[PDB]
From a paper:
Bacteriophage exclusion (‘BREX’) systems are multi-protein complexes encoded by a variety of bacteria and archaea that restrict phage by an unknown mechanism. The final gene in most type 1 BREX systems, termed ‘BrxL’, encodes a large protein (670–700 residues in various species), with much of its sequence predicted to adopt a fold corresponding to the chambered ATP-dependent AAA+ protein family, which are involved in a wide variety of cellular functions throughout all biological kingdoms. In this study we have demonstrated that the BrxL phage restriction factor is a multimeric DNA binding protein that displays ATP-dependent assembly on double stranded DNA.
To study the structure of full-length BrxL we next purified two constructs, wild-type BrxL (BrxLWT) and a variant containing a catalytic point mutation in the ATPase ‘Walker B’ catalytic motif (BrxLE280Q). Grids generated using BrxLE280Q also displayed a mixture of partially and fully assembled protein complexes, with the latter displaying protrusions from each end of the long axis of the complex. A subsequent CryoEM structure determination of full-sized particles produced electron density maps extending to ∼3 Å resolution that correspond to dodecameric particles comprising two six-fold symmetric (hexameric) protein rings, again associated with one another in an antiparallel tail-to-tail arrangement. In addition to the difference in protein copy number and symmetry between the unbound versus DNA-bound BrxL protein assemblages (corresponding to two heptamers versus two hexamers), the BrxLE280Q density maps also demonstrated the unambiguous presence of double stranded DNA spanning the length of the BrxL chamber, which would seem likely to represent DNA from the bacterial expression host that was bound by BrxL during expression and/or cell lysis and then carried through the purification process. The density of the DNA was not of sufficient resolution to directly determine a specific sequence of the bound DNA moiety, and so the modeled identity of bases in the refined model represents an arbitrary sequence based on the best fit to density at each position. Approximately 6 full turns of DNA (62 basepairs) were visible and modeled into the density. The dimensions of the BrxL (E280Q) dodecamer are ∼195 Å in the longest dimension and 140 Å across the exterior diameter of the cylinder. Multiple contacts to the DNA backbone, at each end of the bound duplex, are contributed by basic residues extending from loops contributed by the NTD and the AAA+ domains.
Author numbering:
A (entry chain I): 195 to 486, 491 to 677
B (entry chain C): 583 to 677
C (entry chain J): 195 to 291
């Protein structure tokens, strides 16, 4: 492609390979946003006779898809890569453009005029970023620079990959090699020939996808893995570690899109904890996003941290987030590791909250608001079962609209009748809370019997709070 | 006579212009070098704090060894803070 | 061009050569701003049959680059120098222009 690999890090090389992926996998939608000058448009414009760089993004549906009057297939029937440069300015005279593209990317075949025709063009969306990535993450979602008419969850859900164009360094003449390399025509013919094969099923030999991946996530990760496998191993002889590397990269890039979909679409896309399970040793690996435990100060109201022994008995810290909208008292749950025990714990907690609303809220009606509660694990320890009491705490914190105090982890569990339960392994719970950064702990009164079991240096760091009934637990945790 | 640490917290609050946390009673004392002393009559002092309306208490870390001597019902009434050195006592007091 | 070299400074002569430079390099972009009446637009209009002076600047994208309706290339495929006069008001109705 004309670059000097010696001056680029290995992750940068992998991003450059992900740039080549659209050529080698049929119908591979991908979007790449990055700072100017990172050489995004070079490959699609100069180094391939089977790609077209549609300048300005301003195309017409008859031009791109099907000219009914001339009965001629659009761009997608001619080019294997269609790259929309400077995506930020795209606006369609034909509002069908977004719908037709959604159908094409979701299915690969589109119906126009009198026929349903299939085309294998892979669509790439190249965009320029003006602001810092961290500001874009904190104040908005990463897909902000795309046009407003194109910011749809159903639209972005098709994207088989988002590329982190910021991690590739700004291009410099030092990055251009002077050594021998493959002929660009040879390379492009190689890509076009490799389009005919399939490597998406190589993962099933060694790995299995996690439970957080729905059907479209499976499709995206399979396609990206197949593209990378074709680029790196055309011969077909490869080991388990290579498949692991490719699968890690694919899950990471798809996970980025999944985070953006979460931020833009709310309840639908909380299942973002992408992970994969080895087939041999059955152990599970999690993949995060590089560009993105308990910070100081009061977090947003309805957001708390609880600690509890997992299914494996080890202490783990979970963060519970509640979103409150005007509704009919509906309860929505997510991130519960599809565990029925935690689901029922939260159900009993909300039942108590409805039954005891006036005592805590001072007049607020629970039935007039709908609540969505989500669970995010901070220490990959495992699923939590006991969640009634922290869920009630989050409910009251969100409903009253005042934040949970800084660095409190809420402990103990509650029953339907208002009784509290002692915390098992309180020493390890405090150890983890101090490790996680928690400074203040709220404990049930019945737990105080095990205060002597806590070593001195660990117990010194906590402004311990003791409550008698769940209402007192709520008031003490809230402040 | 045991007034060194409360005097230090007083100076810190007055100079920095920060109000101390409401309903917090500072216990223990310090030497000139900053060595913290254990709270004498910790249980009785806590009972007096409960009688006067204290909701928060600040204690030396070394005094934690006398926590098992504290009654359970008395101890559950406070948000108990354990500092390490007088400067940490200041930080606990001023929040 | 019709200019008297003896009545012009060497620097001004080199600027005049830079005026001809667009005619001699393929795909050569250049911008010149000057006071009214300095003879900027004379050469691009009168001194060559291989240049065009697109007056006003409000020329459409289909006229300039490509018109899909007729599938015939715009100006840039025909003339070796395209000079936009009065760059202050040049504007495109289409945003992609």
């Amino acid at each position: 492609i004309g670059m000097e690999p010696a001056s680029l890090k290995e992750d940068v090389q992998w991003h450059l390979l992900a740039r080549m992926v659209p050529f080698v996998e049929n119908n591979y939608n991908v979007c790449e946003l990055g700072p100017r000058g990172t050489g995004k448009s070079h490959i699609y414009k100069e180094c391939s006779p089977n790609s077209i760089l549609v300048s300005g993004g301003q195309t017409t549906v008859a031009n791109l898809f099907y000219n009914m009057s001339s009965r001629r297939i659009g761009l997608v029937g001619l080019w294997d890569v269609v790259a929309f440069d400077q995506v930020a300015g795209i606006s369609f005279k034909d509002k069908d453009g977004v719908q037709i593209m959604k159908d094409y990317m979701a299915s690969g075949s589109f119906a126009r005029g009198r026929e349903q025709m299939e085309a294998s063009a892979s669509m790439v969306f190249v965009g320029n970023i003006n602001q810092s990535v961290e500001s874009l993450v904190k104040t908005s979602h990463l897909l902000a620079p795309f046009p407003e008419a194109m910011i749809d969850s159903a639209f972005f859900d098709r994207f088989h990959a988002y590329i982190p164009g910021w991690e590739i360094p700004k291009m410099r003449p030092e990055f251009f090699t002077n050594r021998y390399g493959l002929i660009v025509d040879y390379l492009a013919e190689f890509f076009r020939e490799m389009r005919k094969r399939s490597f998406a099923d190589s993962i099933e030999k060694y790995f299995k996808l996690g439970n957080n991946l729905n059907q479209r996530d499976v499709i995206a990760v399979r396609k990206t893995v197949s593209g990378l496998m074709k680029l790196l191993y055309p011969h077909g002889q490869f080991n388990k570690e290579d498949v692991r590397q490719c699968l890690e990269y694919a899950l990471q890039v798809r996970r980025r899109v999944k985070e953006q979909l979460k931020k833009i679409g709310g309840m639908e896309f909380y299942d973002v904890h992408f992970s994969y399970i080895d087939n041999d040793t059955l152990e599970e690996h999690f993949v995060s996003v590089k560009e993105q435990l308990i910070p100081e100060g009061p977090a947003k109201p309805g957001f708390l941290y609880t600690i509890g022994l997992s299914n494996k008995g080890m202490p783990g810290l979970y963060r519970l987030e509640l979103q409150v909208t005007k509704g009919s008292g509906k309860l929505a749950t997510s991130g519960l590791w599809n565990s029925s025990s935690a689901k029922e714990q939260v159900k009993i907690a909300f039942d108590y909250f409805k039954a005891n609303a006036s005592r805590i809220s001072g007049g607020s009606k629970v039935m007039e608001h709908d609540f969505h509660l989500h669970v995010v694990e901070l220490q990959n320890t495992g699923p939590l079962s006991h969640l009634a009491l922290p869920s009630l705490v989050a409910f009251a914190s969100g409903l009253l609209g005042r934040s949970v105090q800084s660095q409190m982890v809420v402990l103990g569990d509650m029953s339907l009748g208002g009784s509290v339960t002692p915390v098992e392994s309180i020493a390890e719970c405090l150890q983890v809370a101090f490790d996680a950064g928690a400074k203040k702990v709220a404990l049930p009164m019945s737990s105080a019997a095990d205060i002597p079991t806590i070593p001195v240096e660990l117990f010194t760091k906590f402004q311990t709070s003791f409550y008698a009934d769940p209402v007192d637990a709520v008031f003490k945790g809230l402040g």
